[PDB]
């Protein structure tokens, strides 16, 4: 489609430049704008026009970051000292395959297996890898912030949804299957006009088996197969020492950048058959620098 | 206290004999009365007096069974062929200590540890050992039968309460802590005019860990300590042939009688300080009749 | 169990004789009692005692008919001229096998398969063959009489439940799966206090496929596997003559009496594995009497 | 069917005699009993037993009069002077045919044509003829008495239902089709336990075409065909002078008794296939008495 030949004024060009600046510097909230540039916010908020422009530019930046640019782009751009690879080696997992799977999963290139699940016993490194990952995406949401009766109230405009120490009830199990597999909600179909558009990755950490759905004062098992069809499970069964601090965006960015450079030939070999359980660590097919 | 000098008539003695028969024949409901002796039920149901007497005698027999006679008397009435012993041996547990603890627990002689917990993965023998105990006692009740919002609605007049594959919610945890610890409910305290209401033993089977209380869409571990003060845990890990069938009342009675017949020296050594987790079988402490 | 040695009076014996008379003559409602014997009803209803006795005897007779005497005895009491065998032959079915299956089904001896489904184009005999078994049993109930939101109100005390031109909605599918399989509800288990409560046979006639569950304005197939495990399906294709005539209980009694006397091996050879579709006719194995 | 062995005492026999007296003398309400025999009512109301017996006898007499005895028997108890025959001659109708049709319709022998409709212009004798036939039957009801939302709430136990100056709305048109066609409501089937327990004759008088069903603020015609099927119509197109007075029970009884013993041929052919409109006179075939 040939773009419309409409020509803008100087104010429109400056507004577009400000939107580009907002998207470039990963500023997506009013508080972040105040913390990053108080001068521009103060100058803009002196009139009605600037107040309208702030909201309009914020919305446009959200849309551009979550719809027009791949999420992995806000993930990229000597590896043995990284904390992420050491953590993934402690729990006997291959860092390269996990990184490639994360790269493919955050771009909605894994099919119906839209959910990533972390499982294991207390202090084993789970809300630390999930929340480092979440802090590197442009916008992320959480199920804990939302109301109990509406756990999926706000999923549009987000790059990731985090469910921390979560359990699935029979009241919402029908809705969760829609969001854990990537199926759009009905209202998203209605306003967009198509049958499937938005999509959103989901990451879950828990201490117990979420395949068991609580019904009343008891538990059922009839929903196990459908839930297992849509998840990839990792076992964090090795406790970690308190010698490790918080995981930061730089560590995960470096880890993913290093993973993206190496050979991908192994990954699609697994991609013929996506398994519920992630493959375990090997030694014949390990990366030479990781030894 | 010297009993009152009241003298009964022929009808009173007949009614007392009927109550004794009802209590001795282990019949406590109208349906079992019709099934066992339809002639007497039909003869009584011919007038208002007989209809009143049916309900009065049923209530009196229930009270006598659940309050005046210890439950362990009903349970009591070669051993290799017993399925209970083999099932408990396959699960790395000593049948003798388990039997002694069951005998002491059903009589409310364990203190604050009023709950028995069976934990383990699918088909390992748990709704089997529990519902043969439930049928070995005069009257038992289920949390499953009760309403969702009132799990502990009916506990008066019961010798046992069974919670099958259940989960503890945060909206009912306050009543759960009281009922699983043997603490009498406030309504019974008010109605009976005393603070010495006995309380009912509880048995729980589950696939997951019930010390993680379901709150909202997450699980909390704040109560995990307190619950551990009121429960004894048994792990059922090994699985069992699909050929062994329903376990029966005769097997439970024989196992409990044989357990009671032996010595009672090792139990009170453990009873000095009760442990949350039931100890496993010992290599040399096993009874000669079981080695 | 030795029955209670209590002895009844003359009035008790007369009441028991009246209950037996009510059972023998298949009188289970007040209107039928008035129609059959107005003299005894008028004599009894002259005082409070007789009015109480009427209801007591009716309840006892219903209970004895439903729970203490097998229903097949009420059905049991040349064959080429019978209408039922001709109707079942027109639809390419063996009347002997159908009769034996009906006899085993009405006594709750089929396990999980408690439902009988008649399906086909209109005017093919479905209501006729089903509402003749219903009139042959002592007491029968109808799903159509009950409320729309509560289709399973009166299922206790019934020998058969009839669902005519029925469709399964998504709101009642949970209770429908339980009732069609012969399992009891929580209320029945709690009131009886026996967990093992017998179910009631169900017969359904319909013009469409009832495995498609109505949800909203759509039909779904997520329950089509559990429903087929509980049902036996017969196809009524051949249209019937416009002067077929209303079927009579005597025809059903004659057909079932003839079927019960014949050999059974051709039934339990198939009864190891129950199929969703009823086996079709076989001229080689057809009984020589009705050739 | 054999009556029960039970025989009554003196009190039971006296109660049965009192019930027979109540049924014979056409006393079916307490006010009628006080008006006809105040002495017996006063002696009965001395104690609780007589008060119970009064209600029991009234209910038994009502049931006997409305279920065990044909209605026409209450109606079958020179001919020029009769007012009914003169009125029917002034309306261009054959009195013999009307009498025979009334006799066959009061006994529920007309099939689906359970309703009788009188239509015509103001003051032409219609609340007259219809309320003189209702005075002859033991017990009758009226749609006027009942609530507007539930016009057919109390129809059990009546020999006739009168709908005076009526009109059919779209809210109840489904229920009326049951009453006007003679089919039982689901409540009657539920309580009695059968499929076709009762059926009540209906008589309707109106000044307009009742086949037009009122819907909202407009009129529909989609229900006309069924109403035409379930009804028989007469045209009272001639008004009457005010000298004529009321129509009594004696006139109706004499008219119906006279029509009962003339012939049953000119009706028998018509009963082969009923027409919506009642045939008019025919001087070719008219009875010599009134000719
Ligand atoms: N805010 C923090 N600052 C420093 N170290 C932290 C912090 N949070 C967690 N850690 C460390 O990270 C490791 C695991 O913590 P965490 O990732 O929260 O565990 P987890 O498996 O998610 N726990 P749990 O929620 O109890 O099942 C431990 O070594 C902690 O000491
Ligand atoms: N109804 C039954 N009839 C015959 N045998 C049975 C029955 N139920 C259980 N069994 C036998 O008992 C074994 C244990 O079953 P069960 O006691 O139900 O296990 P469980 O651990 O409670 N199961 P689950 O509820 O899946 O955690 C089975 O493997 C069968 O061999
Ligand atoms: N009341 C009746 N009296 C006489 N014959 C009847 C009666 N009802 C049905 N039949 C006959 O029996 C046959 C079966 O009719 P019926 O059993 O009502 O049909 P059905 O299979 O339920 N049809 P439908 O409900 O339209 O799918 C027809 O050929 C009818 O003529
Ligand atoms: N209460 C009465 N007292 C005396 N005569 C009456 C009475 N009611 C009716 N009549 C006579 O019966 C005739 C018919 O009246 P009625 O039967 O009420 O007519 P209708 O056509 O049913 N009425 P409507 O359509 O409501 O105007 C009258 O013209 C009177 O002669
Ligand atoms: Mg955590
Ligand atoms: Mg179990
Ligand atoms: Mg039909
Ligand atoms: Mg009028």
Q: Say yes or no: C275 contacts chain B, CB-CB below 8 A.
A: no
Contacts of B18 (CB under 8 A, 6+ apart): B53, B57, C4, C6
Of B35, B37, B46, the CB nearest to C15: B46
Where b means 16+ CB within 10 Å and e means fewer, A263-278 reads eeebbeeeeeeeeeeb
Q: Say yes or no: B250 contacts chain C, CB-CB below 8 A.
A: no
Measuring CA to CA, how many Å separate A20 from each of A5, A57, A71, B108? 21, 9, 17, 73
Contact D6 C43 (CB under 8 A): yes
Contact D192 C35 (CB under 8 A): no
Is B237 flagged in the annotation as binding?
no
Residues of A in contact with B150 (CB under 8 A): none
Q: Which residue, among C184, C261, C172, has the nearest Cα to C223 in the 3D structure?
A: C172
Cα–Cα dist A190/B252, whole Å: 62
D226 C-alpha to ligand 2 centroid (Å): 60
Q: Whose CA is nearest to atom 29 of ligand 2?
A: B242
Whether A129 and A247 have beta carbons less than 8 Å apart is answered as yes
Q: Which of A120, A135, A203, A245 gets mutated to test ligand 1 (max ligand atoms within 8 A of its CB)?
A: A245
Cα–Cα dist C200/C110, whole Å: 12
Contact C11 B46 (CB under 8 A): yes
HSE, side-chain direction, 13 A CA sphere, residue C210: 28
Q: What are φ and ψ of residue A5, in 5° steps? A: -85, 20
Query: Which ligand 4 atom sits closest to the C-alpha of D247?
Result: 12
CA angle A242, A244, A250 (to 5 degrees): 160
- Backbone discontinuities in chain A, residue before each (C to N > 2.5 A): 77
B90 C-alpha to ligand 2 centroid (Å): 15
Contacts of A27 (CB under 8 A, 6+ apart): A33, A36, A37, A61
Q: Which residue, among C2, D181, D224, has the nearest Cα to B39 in the 3D structure?
A: C2
> Which long-range contacts does A178-183 make (Cβ < 8 Å, 24+ apart)?
A179/A152, A179/A155, A180/A114, A180/A115, A180/A227, A180/A230, A180/A231, A181/A112, A181/A114, A181/A115, A181/A229, A181/A230, A182/A108, A182/A112, A182/A114, A182/A230
For B26, which residue in chain C has the nearest alpha carbon?
Answer: C1
Cα–Cα dist B286/D103, whole Å: 95
Residues of A in contact with B151 (CB under 8 A): 217
Per DSSP, the three-state class of C100 is helix
Give the residue ranges of DSSP H helices in B126-170. 127-136
Query: Which ligand 2 atom sits closest to the C-alpha of B165?
Result: 25
Q: For the beta carbon of residue D96, count every other beta carbon within 10 angstroms.
A: 21
Contact A219 B212 (CB under 8 A): no
Per DSSP, the three-state class of B159 is coil
Per DSSP, the three-state class of C274 is coil
Contacts of D248 (CB under 8 A, 6+ apart): D132, D135
What is the rounded radius of gyration, in angstroms, for the C-alpha atoms of chain D? 21
HSE, side-chain direction, 13 A CA sphere, residue A159: 27
Q: For the beta carbon of residue C140, count every other beta carbon within 10 angstroms.
A: 20
Measuring CA to CA, how many Å separate D207 from each of A214, D102, D210, D241, D244? 65, 22, 9, 19, 21
Measuring CA to CA, how many Å separate A206 from each of A124, A167, A209, B6, D126? 11, 8, 8, 67, 82
Contact C16 B31 (CB under 8 A): no
Distance to chain D for C25, nearest Cα, Å = 7
Residues of C in contact with D47 (CB under 8 A): none
Whether C246 and C129 have beta carbons less than 8 Å apart is answered as no
Chain-centroid distance, C-alpha C168: 20
D163 C-alpha to ligand 4 centroid (Å): 16
Q: Say yes or no: B169 contacts chain A, CB-CB below 8 A.
A: yes
Measuring CA to CA, how many Å separate D99 from each of D75, D88, D198, D251? 11, 10, 23, 12
Which candidate in B217, B219, B221 is best for mutational testing of the A interface (most A CBs within 10 A)?
A: B217
Whether A201 and A102 have beta carbons less than 8 Å apart is answered as no
> Dihedral through CA B89, CA B91, CA B97, CA B101, nearest 10?
-130
Q: Say yes or no: D16 contacts chain C, CB-CB below 8 A.
A: yes
Q: For the beta carbon of residue A123, count every other beta carbon within 10 angstroms.
A: 13
Q: What are φ and ψ of residue D136, in 5° steps? A: -80, -35
Strands of the D231-235 sheet, one edge to the other: D141-142, D161-164, D202-206, D115-119, D231-235
Distance to chain A for B196, nearest Cα, Å = 29
Cα–Cα dist C232/C116, whole Å: 5
Cα–Cα dist B232/B276, whole Å: 5
Q: Say yes or no: D60 contacts chain C, CB-CB below 8 A.
A: yes
Resolution for this experimental structure (Å): 2.8
Total residues found in chain B within this entry: 291
For B158, which residue in chain C has the nearest alpha carbon?
Answer: C193
Experimental method: cryo-EM
Q: Say yes or no: C55 contacts chain D, CB-CB below 8 A.
A: no
Q: Say yes or no: B42 contacts chain C, CB-CB below 8 A.
A: yes
Q: Which of residues 200-219 of B touch A (CB under 8 A)?
A: 206-209, 212, 214, 216-219
Per DSSP, the three-state class of D112 is coil
**Would you give the DSSP letter of residue C38?**
H
Whether A83 and A244 have beta carbons less than 8 Å apart is answered as yes
């Amino acid at each position: 489609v040939v773009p419309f030949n409409g020509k803008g004024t100087k104010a429109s060009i400056k507004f577009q430049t400000m939107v580009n600046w907002l998207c470039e510097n990963r500023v997506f909230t009013e508080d972040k704008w105040k913390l990053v540039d108080f001068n521009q916010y103060t100058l803009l908020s002196s009139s009605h026009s600037g107040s309208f422009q702030i909201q309009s530019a914020l919305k446009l930046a959200i849309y551009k970051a979550t719809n027009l640019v791949p999420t992995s782009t806000f993930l990229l751009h000597c590896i043995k000292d990284n904390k992420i690879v050491k953590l993934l080696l402690c729990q006997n997992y291959d860092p390269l395959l996990v990184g490639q799977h994360v790269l493919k999963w955050i771009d909605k290139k894994c099919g119906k297996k839209n959910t990533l699940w972390f499982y294991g016993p207390p202090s084993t490194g789970k809300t630390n890898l999930a929340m480092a990952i979440a802090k590197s995406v442009p916008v992320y949401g959480m199920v804990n912030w939302n109301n109990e009766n509406f756990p999926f109230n706000d999923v549009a405009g987000k790059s990731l949804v985090v469910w921390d120490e979560g359990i699935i009830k029979s009241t919402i199990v029908e809705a969760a299957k829609a969001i854990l597999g990537g199926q759009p909600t009905r209202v998203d179909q209605k306003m967009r006009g198509s049958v499937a558009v938005p999509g959103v990755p989901v990451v879950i950490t828990s201490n117990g088996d979420i395949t068991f759905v609580v019904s009343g004062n008891t538990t059922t098992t009839v929903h196990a197969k459908a839930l297992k069809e849509r998840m990839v499970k990792l076992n964090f069964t090795v406790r970690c020492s308190p010698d490790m601090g918080l995981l930061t965006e730089a560590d995960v960015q470096q880890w993913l950048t290093w993973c993206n450079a190496q050979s991908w030939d192994h990954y699609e070999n697994w991609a013929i058959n996506y398994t519920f359980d992630f493959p375990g660590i090997n030694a014949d097919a390990l990366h030479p620098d990781l030894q």
